[PDB]
Design a protein around this ligand. Structure first.
Ligand SMILES: CNc1nc(F)nc2c1ncn2Cc1cccc(Cl)c1
Length: 164
């Protein structure tokens, strides 16, 4: 069913995450962590304190798809267990130094062709697939986007709900 999912998304905030490579999204799915540039790191830490759930919706550049979505379970923290991100061209390990813990809600893909009817008011009502890394997605758009993903029957949202 989808009732617990809708409960988790209630009054959530949503942010688009754009990764330059698949390897880092695979690492994030394996380890439950994400790192972004300092400008977006500050936005996510503020959002984490402001909302019952902060949802990251992931898309690998040039893939034509979203690869899943996850809920922040912490603010960013430095110095914990390190992470071997595959660093793009203009990217240093100090830029990805802040590590957020995340709980995956859906690890399944959604092609951009399926979200063509959703536009994001916070990005000039462009299709929700359009946006830079860190772009916030308005509540109703983000809720409908997350509900379009195939159900991930491997995930039990009971433990996620308790963190709220
Ligand atoms: C583990 N975190 C990440 N991994 C990868 F691969 N791309 C990321 C990323 N966070 C953001 N981007 C997009 C981006 C923005 C500006 C400049 C570059 Cl070079 C890449």
């Amino acid at each position: 069913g989808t009732s617990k999912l809708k409960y988790v998304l209630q009054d959530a905030r949503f942010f688009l995450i754009k990764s330059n490579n698949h390897e880092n999204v695979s690492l994030a799915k394996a380890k439950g962590v994400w790192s972004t540039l300092p400008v977006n790191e500050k936005k996510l830490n503020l959002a984490f304190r402001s909302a019952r759930s902060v949802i990251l919706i992931f898309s690998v550049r040039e893939s034509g798809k979203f690869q899943g979505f996850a809920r922040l379970s912490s603010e960013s923290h430095h110095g914990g267990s390190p992470i071997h991100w595959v660093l793009p061209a203009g990217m240093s390990a100090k830029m990805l130094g802040g590590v957020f813990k995340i709980d995956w809600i859906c690890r399944r893909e959604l092609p951009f062709t399926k979200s063509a009817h959703l536009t994001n008011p916070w990005n000039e009502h462009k299709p929700v697939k359009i946006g830079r890394d860190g772009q916030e997605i308005e509540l109703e758009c983000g809720t409908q986007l997350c509900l379009l993903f195939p159900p991930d029957e491997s995930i039990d949202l009971y433990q996620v709900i308790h963190k709220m």
